[PDB]
């Protein structure tokens, strides 16, 4: 050809590269040095979706170092030691729920993220240093920690004392939690939060902890307290003190007399009251019919600080769809 | 008509899988793994310590649980 196609303005090469898909974008990196340097551009890499993929730690480290603002990666298997340190990343939204990552590479990766805004570490084992380094963010609007473990009360105190802009916190079902952990959690959670999910602690939850939680934090909208065996019929005064509560979803609180639940119907702001496993048959219909503004026992699962919620096979984490993604098999 | 399978074992872990009826198998989430506060809402009645850890794509109506040993 008589036309110098290499003599192309970068604004056009980037434009044509924008239409290329992820599995093909690595192929054009080898055409020439000019195309190699422009292949790893910060404009192309802005939404990474490596869901359910086996990645070496160096690969994901380099990809993040290329500049990523959203890194979806549920159920991955990066389980090898880290080798080379990397410049600080810019990951604003992250998702590592139900992964296999070991603590060493988890510390190697999370030690560089200092501009985070959302996080989700559901089911992942942690340690003392990894919770301490999460205090560097201080901008975490949402934090998911359901199923986590491995940290002591001091790390939790540091984490909830440094991050003062939390909006949601799904701190639920951490099995190695004593009364000290729950006490520190209710004491040091910032007053700016609007939703909490301190569920599944049983004897470790006491009426005093609920009292200080409702006194310190006058902003709650969702207060799922599931499997709280020690929440008796006298604890409804604390919920009455709440003025912005909308979805209080108790569960299996066996010390709650079902009839007294009609008292909870006095709260004008209440919308839905999920109550499971304590109200028996016959009385459930009477309670539903005698409370004709509350959608009693309607929603089963929790939408609390969860990245992907729904039933339409959504692929967006907190309202952010991933543009550049590894295509799932759909050919015939 | 929920049927519970026999627990099997492995290194420091104990596994059990539960099959679901078609009435409540359509309510199972597909984009996340539930917690004990959520699958006890489905009607499952195991003991304490069972955490859902994987979802079988060919048979979504089978729930998998593992407990440390």
């Amino acid at each position: 050809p008589g036309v110098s196609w290499d003599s192309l303005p970068d604004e056009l090469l980037l434009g044509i590269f924008s239409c290329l898909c992820l599995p093909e974008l690595l192929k054009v990196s080898g055409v020439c040095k000019r195309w190699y340097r422009l292949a790893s551009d910060e404009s192309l890499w802005q939404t990474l979706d490596l869901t359910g993929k086996n990645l070496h730690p160096d690969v994901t480290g380099r990809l993040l170092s290329q500049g990523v603002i959203a890194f979806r990666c549920p159920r991955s298997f990066m389980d090898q030691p880290l080798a080379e340190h990397f410049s600080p990343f810019r990951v604003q939204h992250m998702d590592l729920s139900n992964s296999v990552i070991e603590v060493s590479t988890l510390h190697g990766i999370l030690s560089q993220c200092s501009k985070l805004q959302n996080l989700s570490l559901e089911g992942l084992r942690l340690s003392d240093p990894i919770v301490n380094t999460l205090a560097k963010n201080s901008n975490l609007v949402r934090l998911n920690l359901s199923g986590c473990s491995g940290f002591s009360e001091f790390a939790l105190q540091t984490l909830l004392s440094s991050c003062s802009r939390l909006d949601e916190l799904n701190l639920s079902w951490c099995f190695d939690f004593t009364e000290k952990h729950v006490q520190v959690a209710v004491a040091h959670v910032s007053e700016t939060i609007t939703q909490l999910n301190l569920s599944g602690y049983r004897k470790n939850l006491q009426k005093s902890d609920l009292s200080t939680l409702v006194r310190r934090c006058p902003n709650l909208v969702h207060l799922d307290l599931s499997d709280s065996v020690m929440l008796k019929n006298d604890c409804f005064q604390e919920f009455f003190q709440l003025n912005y509560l909308q979805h209080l979803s108790l569960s299996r609180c066996y010390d709650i007399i079902p009839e007294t639940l009609l008292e909870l119907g006095e709260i004008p702001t209440l919308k839905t009251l999920q109550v499971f496993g304590i109200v028996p048959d016959g009385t459930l219909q009477l309670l539903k019919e005698a409370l004709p503004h509350l959608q009693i026992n309607c929603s089963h699962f929790t939408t609390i600080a969860r990245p992907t919620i729904g039933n339409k096979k959504n692929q967006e984490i907190w309202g952010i769809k991933c543009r550049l993604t590894l295509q799932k098999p759909s050919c015939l | 008509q929920i049927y519970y399978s026999d627990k099997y074992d492995d290194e420091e872990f104990e596994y059990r899988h539960v099959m679901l009826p078609k009435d409540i198998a359509k309510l199972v989430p597909k984009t996340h793994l539930m917690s004990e506060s959520e699958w006890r809402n489905l009607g499952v009645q195991q003991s304490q310590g069972w955490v859902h850890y994987m979802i079988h794509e060919p048979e979504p109506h089978i729930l998998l649980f593992r407990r440390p040993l």
Binding site: Y254, I278 | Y4, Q45, Q46, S47, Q48
Partner: peptide, 15 residues
């Protein structure tokens, strides 16, 4: 009565 299974219902049916 009172608590035939409630409170200790957290166990497999074993039927």
């Amino acid at each position: 009565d009172g608590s035939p299974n409630a409170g200790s219902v957290e166990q497999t049916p074993k039927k």
